[PDB]
Amino acid sequence: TVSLRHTQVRDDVRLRLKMLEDIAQRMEAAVPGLRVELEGVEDKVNRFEKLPAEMAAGNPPKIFDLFGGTDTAKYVKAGRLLELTPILNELGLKDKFPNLQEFTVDGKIYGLPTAYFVEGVFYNKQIFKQLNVDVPRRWEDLMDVAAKAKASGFVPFAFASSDGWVANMMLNTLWVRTAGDDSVPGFVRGTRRWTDPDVADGFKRYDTLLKKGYLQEGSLGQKYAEQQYAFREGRAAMMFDGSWASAALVDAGKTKIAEDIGFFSFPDVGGKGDGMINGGYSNGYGFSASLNEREKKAAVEFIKIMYSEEMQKRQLKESGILPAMKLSDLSGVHPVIREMIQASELRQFPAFDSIVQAKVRETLEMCMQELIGGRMTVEQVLDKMQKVQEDANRDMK
Ligand SMILES: CC(=O)N[C@@H]1[C@@H](O)[C@H](O[C@@H]2O[C@H](CO)[C@@H](O)[C@H](O)[C@H]2NC(C)=O)[C@@H](CO)O[C@H]1O
The domain containing residue 186 runs over which residues? Predict the structure, then answer.
């Protein structure tokens, strides 16, 4: 009766859903007669089809998994999102968020991130030992690691691209490595182009990984979770992924290689984006603008419970999810988690889909699956990306 849309649908992320269910009872106990109705929708389905449709028709869920940047800006300007500054003041929470920028439109706040993310390279410390390689810090090191991994029968990069957004993760970072993080805002303001040779350098580097079989071959047939299977079952030396992936990686009778799992920032390439890491405060929950009194009370309770040090610590301890809020203790965690916090000290850039329009993101997904399938060249990809980028920029008016 009060709808709570989330994307925690995989069995592997059961602890994250169980936390949502705990939050849902606590809301119900706080608000008599309240009935919370959790609805899980697969991430890409929720974000790129279901929720955009509901927003256009004006009937979004009351509480919903929401992304900052482009998505929030679109629903704000359509009047769909509850402004959260009165509530944040009531609860004393506003300044326990180090970064709400993706959710701030004209100084006003329309969502709350539940996590801080980084994206980089998970690796198997025991496979690296076997191959007698150190952590690769630059491109030519990476090539050596990948060549030795493959020579020994390991997949260099566990990789699955049936879900198109997965292919864009390492890509994001590759073209930002070569062209700098300012390339992506440049795309939407018309001062940088997808076809520019410094952008293209990162695409060609990605294609080199394809051409050498360092990105897992046959990946177009595999759903996102399959790259995590390959890595956690010890078949791949590395996997480029987000920090949220540890919720599916390192516990119990699934994971051969739990303690020898590590993480490093992607090697430098001698380009304008060296020394940076993909990360930010992008994903959390938004709230319908159409809330009545019980509904608002439920949303306030949800905020009070979810955005607390108790729940932030719980999801860190249980599932490795890095906190979006300021914490008191935060101590005692898996090595891979130290290594991620370590790697997050670098200069940061947000995911490209927080900056570009939906149509551009969708086109990059489809273009990369064609590139992975050998059905488009890098030249064709960037030509098409730039045309769509021009159209999107014009349609912003
Ligand atoms: C709070 C949390 O852990 N959210 C995770 C999401 O961030 C993640 O989705 C992906 O996040 C990237 C970083 O913002 C985006 O660039 C990427 O587009 C996005 N993917 C989709 C399909 O929206 C998902 C992955 O399933 O896990 C969440 O738990």
Answer: 119-279+346-395
